[PDB]
PDB file of C-alpha atoms in Angstrom:
ATOM      1  CA  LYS P 245      82.128  -3.656 124.088  1.00  0.00           C
ATOM      2  CA  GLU P 246      83.925  -6.433 126.013  1.00  0.00           C
ATOM      3  CA  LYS P 247      83.326  -5.207 129.571  1.00  0.00           C
ATOM      4  CA  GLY P 248      81.640  -8.480 130.509  1.00  0.00           C
ATOM      5  CA  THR P 249      79.232  -9.015 133.369  1.00  0.00           C
ATOM      6  CA  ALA P 250      79.139  -6.026 135.701  1.00  0.00           C
ATOM      7  CA  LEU P 251      79.121  -6.412 139.473  1.00  0.00           C
ATOM      8  CA  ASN P 252      75.503  -5.222 139.513  1.00  0.00           C
ATOM      9  CA  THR P 253      74.474  -8.678 138.250  1.00  0.00           C
ATOM     10  CA  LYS P 254      76.808 -10.970 140.224  1.00  0.00           C
ATOM     11  CA  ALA P 255      77.202  -9.306 143.631  1.00  0.00           C
ATOM     12  CA  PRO P 256      76.800 -11.926 146.390  1.00  0.00           C
ATOM     13  CA  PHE P 257      74.016 -11.713 148.963  1.00  0.00           C
ATOM     14  CA  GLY P 258      71.708  -9.789 146.639  1.00  0.00           C
ATOM     15  CA  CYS P 259      73.698  -6.586 147.145  1.00  0.00           C
ATOM     16  CA  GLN P 260      72.207  -3.854 144.984  1.00  0.00           C
ATOM     17  CA  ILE P 261      74.807  -1.434 143.622  1.00  0.00           C
ATOM     18  CA  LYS P 262      74.518   2.336 143.278  1.00  0.00           C
ATOM     19  CA  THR P 263      77.264   4.312 141.567  1.00  0.00           C
ATOM     20  CA  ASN P 264      77.395   8.054 142.260  1.00  0.00           C
ATOM     21  CA  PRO P 265      78.383   7.545 145.918  1.00  0.00           C
ATOM     22  CA  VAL P 266      79.625   4.064 144.993  1.00  0.00           C
ATOM     23  CA  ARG P 267      78.029   1.732 147.514  1.00  0.00           C
ATOM     24  CA  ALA P 268      76.361  -1.644 147.994  1.00  0.00           C
ATOM     25  CA  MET P 269      72.905  -1.538 149.576  1.00  0.00           C
ATOM     26  CA  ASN P 270      70.735  -4.179 151.253  1.00  0.00           C
ATOM     27  CA  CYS P 271      73.660  -6.575 151.744  1.00  0.00           C
ATOM     28  CA  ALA P 272      72.077  -9.370 153.804  1.00  0.00           C
ATOM     29  CA  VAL P 273      75.190 -10.642 155.578  1.00  0.00           C
ATOM     30  CA  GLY P 274      76.227 -11.034 159.195  1.00  0.00           C
ATOM     31  CA  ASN P 275      74.696  -9.856 162.453  1.00  0.00           C
ATOM     32  CA  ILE P 276      74.504  -6.324 163.864  1.00  0.00           C
ATOM     33  CA  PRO P 277      75.170  -6.195 167.626  1.00  0.00           C
ATOM     34  CA  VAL P 278      73.029  -3.571 169.351  1.00  0.00           C
ATOM     35  CA  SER P 279      73.669  -2.013 172.763  1.00  0.00           C
ATOM     36  CA  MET P 280      70.840   0.123 174.131  1.00  0.00           C
ATOM     37  CA  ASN P 281      70.627   2.322 177.226  1.00  0.00           C
ATOM     38  CA  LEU P 282      67.130   3.101 178.447  1.00  0.00           C
ATOM     39  CA  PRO P 283      65.575   5.497 180.972  1.00  0.00           C
ATOM     40  CA  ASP P 284      63.436   3.926 183.672  1.00  0.00           C
ATOM     41  CA  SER P 285      60.542   6.119 182.514  1.00  0.00           C
ATOM     42  CA  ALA P 286      60.222   3.879 179.448  1.00  0.00           C
ATOM     43  CA  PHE P 287      59.641   0.752 181.540  1.00  0.00           C
ATOM     44  CA  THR P 288      56.427  -0.030 183.423  1.00  0.00           C
ATOM     45  CA  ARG P 289      56.052  -0.803 187.118  1.00  0.00           C
ATOM     46  CA  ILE P 290      55.115  -4.377 187.994  1.00  0.00           C
ATOM     47  CA  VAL P 291      52.587  -3.114 190.544  1.00  0.00           C
ATOM     48  CA  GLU P 292      50.787  -1.482 187.595  1.00  0.00           C
TER      49      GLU P 292
ATOM     50  CA  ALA V 293      32.687 -10.043 207.653  1.00  0.00           C
ATOM     51  CA  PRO V 294      32.574 -11.744 204.218  1.00  0.00           C
ATOM     52  CA  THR V 295      33.699 -15.327 204.731  1.00  0.00           C
ATOM     53  CA  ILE V 296      36.572 -16.700 202.635  1.00  0.00           C
ATOM     54  CA  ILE V 297      36.900 -20.311 201.454  1.00  0.00           C
ATOM     55  CA  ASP V 298      39.475 -22.029 199.210  1.00  0.00           C
ATOM     56  CA  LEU V 299      42.284 -19.511 199.626  1.00  0.00           C
ATOM     57  CA  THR V 300      45.283 -20.017 197.342  1.00  0.00           C
ATOM     58  CA  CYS V 301      48.524 -18.140 196.698  1.00  0.00           C
ATOM     59  CA  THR V 302      50.052 -17.746 193.254  1.00  0.00           C
ATOM     60  CA  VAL V 303      52.966 -15.315 193.006  1.00  0.00           C
ATOM     61  CA  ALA V 304      52.836 -13.692 189.575  1.00  0.00           C
ATOM     62  CA  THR V 305      56.440 -12.484 189.790  1.00  0.00           C
ATOM     63  CA  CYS V 306      58.854 -11.878 192.664  1.00  0.00           C
ATOM     64  CA  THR V 307      61.932  -9.644 192.606  1.00  0.00           C
ATOM     65  CA  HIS V 308      63.472  -9.062 196.021  1.00  0.00           C
ATOM     66  CA  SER V 309      64.060  -5.370 195.363  1.00  0.00           C
ATOM     67  CA  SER V 310      64.325  -2.754 198.092  1.00  0.00           C
ATOM     68  CA  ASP V 311      60.789  -1.556 197.330  1.00  0.00           C
ATOM     69  CA  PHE V 312      57.696  -3.699 196.733  1.00  0.00           C
ATOM     70  CA  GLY V 313      59.026  -5.926 193.959  1.00  0.00           C
ATOM     71  CA  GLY V 314      56.666  -8.877 194.160  1.00  0.00           C
ATOM     72  CA  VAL V 315      53.030  -9.305 193.115  1.00  0.00           C
ATOM     73  CA  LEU V 316      50.898 -12.195 194.372  1.00  0.00           C
ATOM     74  CA  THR V 317      47.268 -12.868 193.451  1.00  0.00           C
ATOM     75  CA  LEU V 318      44.946 -14.744 195.808  1.00  0.00           C
ATOM     76  CA  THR V 319      42.164 -16.920 194.402  1.00  0.00           C
ATOM     77  CA  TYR V 320      39.319 -17.362 196.882  1.00  0.00           C
ATOM     78  CA  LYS V 321      35.579 -18.040 197.004  1.00  0.00           C
ATOM     79  CA  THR V 322      33.551 -15.552 199.038  1.00  0.00           C
ATOM     80  CA  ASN V 323      29.870 -15.168 199.909  1.00  0.00           C
ATOM     81  CA  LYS V 324      29.453 -11.393 199.512  1.00  0.00           C
ATOM     82  CA  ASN V 325      31.407  -8.220 198.730  1.00  0.00           C
ATOM     83  CA  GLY V 326      33.264  -5.823 201.000  1.00  0.00           C
ATOM     84  CA  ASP V 327      36.664  -5.207 202.562  1.00  0.00           C
ATOM     85  CA  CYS V 328      38.675  -6.902 205.293  1.00  0.00           C
ATOM     86  CA  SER V 329      42.230  -7.204 206.519  1.00  0.00           C
ATOM     87  CA  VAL V 330      45.241  -8.920 204.966  1.00  0.00           C
ATOM     88  CA  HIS V 331      48.664  -9.598 206.442  1.00  0.00           C
ATOM     89  CA  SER V 332      51.741 -11.814 206.128  1.00  0.00           C
ATOM     90  CA  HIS V 333      52.088 -13.800 209.347  1.00  0.00           C
ATOM     91  CA  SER V 334      55.740 -14.555 208.628  1.00  0.00           C
ATOM     92  CA  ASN V 335      58.374 -11.820 208.419  1.00  0.00           C
ATOM     93  CA  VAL V 336      60.278 -12.722 205.235  1.00  0.00           C
ATOM     94  CA  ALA V 337      57.727 -10.678 203.259  1.00  0.00           C
ATOM     95  CA  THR V 338      56.045  -7.337 203.968  1.00  0.00           C
ATOM     96  CA  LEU V 339      52.767  -6.473 202.257  1.00  0.00           C
ATOM     97  CA  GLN V 340      52.167  -3.045 200.755  1.00  0.00           C
ATOM     98  CA  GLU V 341      48.408  -2.962 201.305  1.00  0.00           C
TER      99      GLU V 341
END
């Protein structure tokens, strides 16, 4: 009866909350560094 | 031989790689169509064609 406001309605950064595998989804915070290795087949020759 | 007037270099992109890593386009003004020779008088660059 007195639980109060759940975290589903006050989580910062619009984080939606799912319970069963307790988790916060769509948290719009921070930056994700990305390192990518590519094969030269993907690129295109300048002469073309 | 088709005559050429107003010849101009404009290097699209140059990368001094071991292979042909530089593309230059020549803007000219000819009188007719055909083929004729090209060459780099200096030595710092070597043309593919």
